[PDB]
Amino acid sequence: LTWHDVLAEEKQQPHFLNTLQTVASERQSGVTIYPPQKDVFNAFRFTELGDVKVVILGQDPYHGPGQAHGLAFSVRPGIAIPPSLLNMYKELENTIPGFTRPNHGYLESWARQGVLLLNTVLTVRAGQAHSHASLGWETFTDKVISLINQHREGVVFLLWGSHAQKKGAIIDKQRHHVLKAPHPSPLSAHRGFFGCNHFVLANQWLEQHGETPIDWMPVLPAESE
């Protein structure tokens, strides 16, 4: 099954389509909306349903120029690493053998290994956090999570912060593996995100079940001649 197979009906629901209408309207009314329309669903593009190994929820897309490009916690090449991702990198550096601080915040290569980097809200107005949170995106991502729970087996979910924890509170904790911790934002990272060890634990679960671990060191697309 592909994402479109399992979400085709969901994407004909008014809460979904009216959301996209709203976004398209605001973009033409002098409001900058992030990410660009072609990037809104990049988490799905880069991590097909059958390839999901680890789900990491974000909440809102980043709301500044150059930041959001459709993957939770990631930013485009050449853009500063946002504080939440810096704290993820610090936990990685303290736990994954050989990890060192990347010089970029671009996480496509996680997605390409099976890490679904899913914000629960998929658009935002420039400079205004949570400004699209009361559209239909949470309903849409509730359905995404429900479908992974039902259609996949042995997925590791990393639920960071209360919002994410609530979002994933009904995941099957026997067929899947649910790990919780405070959010890596500077407001909460020292309240238990540091020390959560989720990246190693996720890889050990995956290993235990015959899946390859995630290489958490993210890499930029290369140059050609």
Side-chain angles (χ1 to χ4, degrees), residues 39-75:
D39 296 318
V40 165
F41 296 102
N42 283 349
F44 303 89
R45 284 199 200 266
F46 303 165
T47 308
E48 249 303 341
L49 176 61
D51 290 339
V52 172
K53 286 168 99 152
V54 185
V55 173
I56 306 177
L57 302 188
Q59 184 173 6
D60 218 39
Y62 294 121
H63 59 68
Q67 292 182 314
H69 62 103
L71 300 183
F73 293 107
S74 191
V75 296

Side-chain angles (χ1 to χ4, degrees), residues 2 29 50 107 141 150 171:
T2 63
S29 83
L107 311 179
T141 57
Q150 288 167 355
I171 293 157

Side-chain angles (χ1 to χ4, degrees), residues 31-201:
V31 190
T32 290
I33 297 306
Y34 292 134
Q37 162 152 56
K38 73 188 177 341
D39 296 318
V40 165
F41 296 102
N42 283 349
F44 303 89
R45 284 199 200 266
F46 303 165
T47 308
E48 249 303 341
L49 176 61
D51 290 339
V52 172
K53 286 168 99 152
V54 185
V55 173
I56 306 177
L57 302 188
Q59 184 173 6
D60 218 39
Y62 294 121
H63 59 68
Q67 292 182 314
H69 62 103
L71 300 183
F73 293 107
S74 191
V75 296
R76 290 179 196 281
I79 299 295
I81 302 155
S84 279
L85 182 51
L86 282 167
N87 285 338
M88 289 158 65
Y89 278 175
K90 294 183 194 141
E91 181 66 11
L92 282 161
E93 192 154 9
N94 291 334
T95 52
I96 289 290
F99 188 99
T100 60
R101 171 74 50 80
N103 66 351
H104 71 271
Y106 188 68
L107 311 179
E108 185 180 339
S109 72
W110 292 7
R112 297 295 187 179
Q113 291 178 77
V115 187
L116 187 67
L117 288 170
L118 182 61
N119 279 324
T120 58
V121 172
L122 293 184
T123 53
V124 64
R125 294 173 183 170
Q128 311 293 324
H130 303 288
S131 44
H132 283 175
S134 60
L135 308 183
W137 288 124
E138 293 281 345
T139 303
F140 175 65
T141 57
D142 282 346
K143 182 65 175 168
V144 170
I145 292 171
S146 181
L147 287 169
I148 300 166
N149 185 58
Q150 288 167 355
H151 281 93
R152 299 295 329 275
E153 298 281 334
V155 176
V156 179
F157 291 78
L158 308 182
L159 303 185
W160 295 343
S162 294
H163 183 87
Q165 284 172 11
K166 185 163 188 274
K167 192 81 179 173
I170 68 190
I171 293 157
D172 184 342
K173 288 201 258 97
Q174 308 117 92
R175 289 161 52 253
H176 293 111
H177 196 59
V178 174
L179 293 173
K180 298 177 283 156
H183 189 283
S185 147
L187 290 199
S188 48
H190 299 270
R191 308 173 70 133
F193 179 75
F194 293 134
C196 78
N197 197 206
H198 279 6
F199 303 101
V200 167
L201 294 174

